[PDB]
Structure formats: structure tokens, C-alpha cells
């Protein structure tokens, strides 16, 4: 015998392969695995990892937030591993160069009308092999509604979690345990 933990074997804690079956995505995975291996650049490793993640870890990015992130980076390229969407709250748009996995129709029209362009990842592999003058960006990953129920249970003192309820009103879970007048508040 011998006194090891998890005997002599090393633990890893994440996703290892694609689950999706889109042939084009499989070709992309092959390409960026090759690029990551043969030029250890830390730019292609991260991209090779990000396009393996599940849907909830590839959130969309709005046009306005993308323009805000690129304000001090003229004539550079923004790289997103998600979709980018339109934003009616903006009045005007600048000229931008953006590579993303998907664009919506309105966002694609607005970008090209200002003189910009939209890129796929196989073109970025051909023009910026090691990511020179490229900026990696992510969207908000904890803005989903499901994350509002996680954390401390609703009922523990000073929590912020939403409850699961049929509907909302004065008759739906507002009496005992949420006000001092019925025996205690939270």
C-alpha cells in the first residue's frame, strides 16, 4: 500500500470536447487547436478554449457597449466569441472592425452603413495569425435571470435572491416573514 490522495491520479475540473455537432464549428475547433499548438501565443489558446464553452458562457454583446469598449482603440479589431446585437438607444455609430461568431441582421446593417466591416474567425486566422492589434472582449455572463435565484436562500438574513412564485401581488407571499407586523421580517 501507499498513502496518496485520489491515489496517484490528477484531477481536472472542466469541459474537454465539443458537445455540438455543427460541422463548421468542428472545422473551426480543429483550426484553432492547430494554431494554439504550433504557435503557443496565449491569444489562440484562449480562443480555442472559449469556442468550446456552453451557450450560457457565450452571452451577446450590444452595439453600444462594443463602441464604448473601443473608444480609446481606433483602427483596432474587436474579437468576440458570441453574437452582437442592435441597440435602439444609440443615436449614431462610428466606424468599427469586428470579428464575431454571429451578427443579427439589424446590427450587421448598421455596422456596414457606417463604413465598418464584419469578420468571421476563419478570416481572422488568415490575417492576424497571432492576434496583433486585436482586443478580446466578453459580454455580461451573470446577467441571466436564472442567476437571480442562486446564492443564499431567500429567507436567510439580508439575502437578495428571487423566490419561485405563481404570480405577483399582495396575496402572493408578502405576509409572515417579510414584514415586522406579522411576526418578523426576513
Amino acid at each position: 500500500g501507499i498513502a496518496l490522495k485520489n491515489v496517484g491520479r490528477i484531477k481536472k475540473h472542466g469541459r474537454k470536447h465539443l458537445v455540438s455537432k455543427n460541422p463548421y464549428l468542428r472545422l473551426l475547433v480543429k483550426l484553432y487547436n492547430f494554431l494554439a499548438r504550433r504557435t503557443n501565443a496565449n491569444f489562440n489558446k484562449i480562443i480555442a478554449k472559449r469556442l468550446i464553452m456552453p451557450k450560457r458562457y457565450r452571452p451577446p454583446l450590444s452595439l453600444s457597449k462594443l463602441q464604448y469598449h473601443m473608444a480609446n482603440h481606433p483602427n483596432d479589431i474587436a474579437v468576440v466569441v458570441g453574437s452582437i446585437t442592435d441597440d435602439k438607444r444609440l443615436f449614431s455609430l462610428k466606424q468599427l472592425k469586428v470579428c464575431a461568431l454571429r451578427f443579427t441582421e439589424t446590427a450587421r446593417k448598421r455596422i456596414e452603413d457606417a463604413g465598418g466591416e464584419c469578420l468571421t474567425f476563419d478570416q481572422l486566422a488568415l490575417k492576424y495569425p497571432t492576434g496583433k492589434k486585436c482586443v478580446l472582449l466578453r459580454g455580461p455572463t451573470k446577467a441571466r435571470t436564472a442567476e437571480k435565484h442562486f446564492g443564499k436562500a431567500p429567507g436567510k438574513p439580508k439575502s437578495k435572491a428571487r423566490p419561485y412564485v405563481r404570480s405577483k401581488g399582495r396575496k402572493f407571499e408578502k405576509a409572515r416573514g417579510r414584514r415586522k407586523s406579522r411576526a418578523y421580517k426576513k
Binding site: 435565484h149 436562500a153 419561485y164 412564485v165 405563481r166
Partner: protein, 53 residues
Amino acid sequence: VAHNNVLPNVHLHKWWQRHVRVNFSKNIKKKKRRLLREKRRKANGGTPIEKLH
């Protein structure tokens, strides 16, 4: 009940099996209805079967 779920609400406490209705013929019926209102037109012989509202 034991987990973080919503509290249950289902109204299944009477003899609910006697009156259940699966709809197998919602397109057969519309074919039948179309043929009847088309048969009416050939008997009106030129006048329409609608009325002004």
C-alpha cells in the same frame, strides 16, 4: 415537499379521466366546412353568401 421548488398547485382531485378530449380531426373538419360553404355558392347561382355589416 422537499427542495427549492415552487409550491404545487394542480387541480386534479376529482375523477378527471372521464372527461378528457384529444383532437384528432381539426383539419378533417375544416375540409368539411369549406366544402359545405362552397356547395352553398353553386346553389345561389351568382349572388354572394355574405352580408353587409
